[PDB]
Amino acid sequence: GPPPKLCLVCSDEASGCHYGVLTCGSCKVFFKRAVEGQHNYLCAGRNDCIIDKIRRKNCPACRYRKCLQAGMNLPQLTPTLVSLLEVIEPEVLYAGYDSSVPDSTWRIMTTLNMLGGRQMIAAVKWAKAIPGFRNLHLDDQMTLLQYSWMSLMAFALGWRSYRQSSANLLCFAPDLIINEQRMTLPDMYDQCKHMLYVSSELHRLQVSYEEYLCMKTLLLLSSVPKDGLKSQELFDEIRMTYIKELGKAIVKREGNSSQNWQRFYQLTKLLDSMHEVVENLLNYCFQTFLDKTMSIEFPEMLAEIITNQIPKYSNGNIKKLLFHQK
């Protein structure tokens, strides 16, 4: 008797070749229902759930994604670079926000700056753990963090907001969530909308965890001094490694020759728009820092980076790296 054919989606015995792909009966009708049904399936995990006979009812967002990766229409104890990135991912920090007291723009922005300072501290220890960062010069390491701190904070905040609040709210910390009430507070709305674009794009693109981990490391290596770095030769091969790393994460995710490129296009196109997001986020942050009348509190760590950055952008000595235009 012939060896049982397997479902390219849930690994249960396949009933035939349905919708172009060797699929089972349960997977076939799930796919016809997802297309015609008009659903905005959300993932409780990180867009990389395991789809098998036992867990196919588990996630319809990842099962409907796996039907498109297999092609429907109408060992592993060898660490990889991204397995290290996952393990060195900073923990969730709490804002220390006293919810038993009424909100205010000052108290909210001060708390988030004081929190952002601690997030920065972790972002330094994270950078040290990235393979090859401490191989570069100290003046380069200091520069890379100074230049890309806002890309790392708005990217990690955008992903936390995507995952935790369906991409509707900003999830700064478990205790300080900028809700619809807090967003319409004075001087809040416009800055929050920039952070929300990051979350809204990660939502539209259904970014997977491995893809996110690679895009984040690539964001640290996205802004360079106009003339270059002390160890620029090394910087280039390090950045090139994580572009190949991103491409590896896109191969698992898409499972198709032509899909692999259309995907790389969008993620790298988002990585480009991150320079415009950070351009706008820093314009308001710098204006607030210099605004003596607002008098919002910035921590000793963050204030130091802000002062040593304001005349570097206004100098043009910042070569923003692009994947698509230049």
Add this chain to the structure above:
Amino acid sequence: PKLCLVCSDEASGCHYGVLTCGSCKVFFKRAVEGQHNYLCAGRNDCIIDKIRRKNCPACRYRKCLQAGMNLPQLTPTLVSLLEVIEPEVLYAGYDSSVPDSTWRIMTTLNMLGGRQMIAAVKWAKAIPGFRNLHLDDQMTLLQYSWMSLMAFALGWRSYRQSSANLLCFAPDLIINEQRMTLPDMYDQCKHMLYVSSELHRLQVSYEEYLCMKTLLLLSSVPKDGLKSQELFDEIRMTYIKELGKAIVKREGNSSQNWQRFYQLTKLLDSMHEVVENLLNYCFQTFLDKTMSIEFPEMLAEIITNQIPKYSNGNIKKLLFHQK
């Protein structure tokens, strides 16, 4: 404001030691009695919220045990008129039996867009108090807001016919992800996509959309002022009050209503950058002698007459927030 310690849905009482909703009470009592092998598909940290509680039973059962569970109308309103004069949906006339092209898609959409632009003229000609304006203002307002009206109406159709994720241009021509990554297409779609995303994010009403689109027609004015500025200013604040009336018909809490007006008028403001960015690519394409995409005469006349107005700075874009 009672919230479920497991799924964050409105809790119904203190069930099995913890404040939970009715759905989690029976999930827990079921999961305990039925000796189950609940396997997690992620990293055993799945998010358990109202929308995703059905997803990971392994993580929901873990969250349950963590929380500490154990065993006569005849008078027409202004907005009722806008509902009647709202234009019908048109068909692109796209033959899907032939492979897609950037040229074929942009040209079909320009052709349909020209017809949608004619329907905007009949629609504006029927807005209460719009016909009352001077004719050289009725056509100035139509020319300034033409892309604002089309993007907002497209955004509403995309929001309504699915969610933010795609561009419902015509019942027969929808722009999916594989279509969006065609040459030159991505950047222009990105702006349209934003309009559907905000409409979705805000869960905008039809009565709210109707009012906002009328305010989008009355959003741009000449730098040297309109010939009927006394009347335009009066028509505009009538529709601003009308938008407020349509926000009243929703929730009804004073601060909720104020905040909703803040968010809605913030979107009406952002439409000026969305249209500025949509026009930069449109005008670039219109002049391009390599792409050769054909625009209908209806839209070519507007593009031609709008390029030097845009440069001269004779467009006073109105703002609700003036930040």
Add this chain to the structure above:
Amino acid sequence: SLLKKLLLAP
């Protein structure tokens, strides 16, 4: 020098 001291320390 506060950012430098965070980098220098092990």
Add this chain to the structure above:
DNA sequence: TCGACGGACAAAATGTTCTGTAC
């Protein structure tokens, strides 16, 4: 009187079998 338990009933989500139809 209120509030929680569980049973009874219902809705949502998933899966199988039967049928038509093209070879």
Add this chain to the structure above:
DNA sequence: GTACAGAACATTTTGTCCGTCGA
């Protein structure tokens, strides 16, 4: 005489309404 699409029935999993019973 196989092999699929879609409809029809079916099962599984999840959610609500309600009467009971102790306080």
